[PDB]
Write a protein that binds this ligand. Structure first.
Ligand code: ZDC
Ligand code: ZDC
Ligand code: ZDC
Ligand code: ZDC
Ligand code: CA
Ligand code: CA
Ligand code: CA
Ligand code: CA
Ligand code: CA
Ligand code: CA
Ligand code: CA
Ligand code: CA
Lengths: 114, 8, 114, 114, 114
């Protein structure tokens, strides 16, 4: 199934934060309305934040996360969770190799803000 | 099935 | 129900990251085996990462998040989600006031690392 | 925080199904638009289905689950999970005593149908 | 990434329940320790509970869900959620055609029981 695509309420601010756990340099693209809105890159094996950004979900509300290592897209897992019918998490794991810990880039999208 | 009626 | 308490595998490294979305100064304490292992404080209405850290779950694996504003405990909501049977998130939201957006301090715990 | 309350898309059919794991007879009420739309009661310590029904979320989309055991309100836990940005689960556990297993009545709501 | 595979606590009773939402007759197989332990089938576009059963996770705790329609395997999506650090849901959706609603067979595993 398609992974890493989330429909947020339209015109709503959200946070997106990426962590790295890989010897490969991670590249995270965040698309809004099918257009690149933010790009992160960094390398860590210790969960370092390689980027964190406030964005707007735009007219469609469609947010997509892509993850790449040295030009090669990683395999993605994702889900959305909602607590007390109000607090929203869209979660992405990614795998760049063969060990399948799926933590190589970890991306957390949260809303509402403020 | 020549009549497009292979049904579930 | 009790919220903000998670049983992790013993002796496992994990990331803990806190975001702030409130006019009140958030205090986030992360306890491991009932001892404070990390504290973050900060004020933001724009999802600031007021702290991130790598901790070890230790012999008991018990991890607890506490959130307080000027000494008063916030009301907590939480859950844990596991992707592809491997990638773990423990999620915490909190409310310090009356609007029930439950984003005033948001805490995300992830494992495995590395 | 409020538990057992979910905002569904308006005018959408959803399934609701309840399981029982307690020596007490469970009473499960499902409210749509703040009116009771379905009631399940049954007793099992072996996860028996005590009720399953298809409902419509109505104009408001507000769906609320309440659990009772002989007039005593059960404490609730709940969350909503969305898979591949399409498949929705609204999950409710409940506790009628002090052993804190929260499985005494388990309620699963899922949509879309068809 | 692999989907529909869950590591449960060893030697623990769990419920497994399948719902159908398709014109195609669903077949749900449940494997424990790589051996078929339950099989459900039915045909409904209205969320029929085509099967429900209590199984034991056995010494390995490995539980796998597989879905097919008239011989062809369905694409699966899955995740596990834990409420108040005690109540577990392993969730599965599946797609047998091209409309990508991933509800064609829905499978919920829950534990603990009793
Ligand atoms: C150190 C390793 O870096 C990658 C592989 C290369 O090497 C990741 O896929 C692994 O999970 C691990 O983090
Ligand atoms: C700016 C506000 O700050 C708090 C209350 C004070 O004021 C939070 O509870 C609100 O949700 C909101 O972020
Ligand atoms: C058999 C017991 O029934 C209840 C208490 C009475 O007794 C539940 O709260 C327990 O979790 C357990 O299922
Ligand atoms: C076959 O007709 C497709 C199939 O059944 C439909 C009624 C609908 O439920 C669709 O989601 C499913 O894949
Ligand atoms: Ca890896
Ligand atoms: Ca890794
Ligand atoms: Ca608030
Ligand atoms: Ca707030
Ligand atoms: Ca109980
Ligand atoms: Ca019980
Ligand atoms: Ca389908
Ligand atoms: Ca369908």
């Amino acid at each position: 199934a398609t992974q890493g695509v989330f429909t947020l309420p339209a015109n709503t601010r959200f946070g997106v934060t990426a962590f790295a756990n890989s010897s490969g340099t991670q590249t995270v693209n965040v698309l809004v309305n099918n257009e690149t809105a933010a790009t992160f890159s960094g390398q860590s094996t210790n969960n370092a934040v390689i980027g964190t950004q406030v964005l707007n979900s735009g007219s469609s509300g469609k947010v997509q996360v892509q993850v790449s290592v040295n030009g090669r897209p990683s395999d993605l897992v994702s889900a959305q969770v909602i607590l007390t019918n109000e607090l929203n998490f869209a979660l992405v794991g990614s795998e760049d190799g063969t060990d399948n810990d799926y933590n190589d880039a970890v991306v957390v999208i949260n809303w509402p803000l403020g | 099935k020549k009549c497009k009626l292979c049904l579930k």
